[PDB]
Amino acid sequence: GSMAGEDVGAPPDHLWVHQEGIYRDEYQRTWVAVVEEETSFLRARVQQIQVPLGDAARPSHLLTSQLPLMWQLYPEERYMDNNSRLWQIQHHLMVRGVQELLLKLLPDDRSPGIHRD
């Protein structure tokens, strides 16, 4: 009988990198992917904010060359690129009226095998 707040509505089922460290949602929502190389992994902090899309090349891919040209929200709780990798949604929430989606890329999670039966 308190009535908790409310969590984000829904993440970007898909993202389209238009600017270095930026991505476009499927609802005209710009994102800011802050490629943050992990100690031993890849993290692309996608922050949702209102910013004008400047250029439209592949500077981030040329510079960083980590984030895909498009993400595809897959089942479970991860984002599947179009290159040939699956990024794990490290965390997705909203802060200061901004949606910060954390994407973690791994070296193709070792194929699962039926261990014992």
Structural domain boundaries in the chain: 1-117
Strands 42-48 and 23-24: unpaired
The helix/strand/coil state of 84 is coil
User: Of 60, 47, 44, 16, which Cα lies nearest the Cα of 103?
Assistant: 44
CATH of domain 1-117: 2.40.15.10
| Rounded distance between C-alpha atoms, residue 21 and residue 53, angstroms | 11
| Amino acid present at 76 | E
- What is the Cα–Cα distance from 100 to 102, expressed in whole angstroms? 6
Q: How was this structure determined?
A: NMR
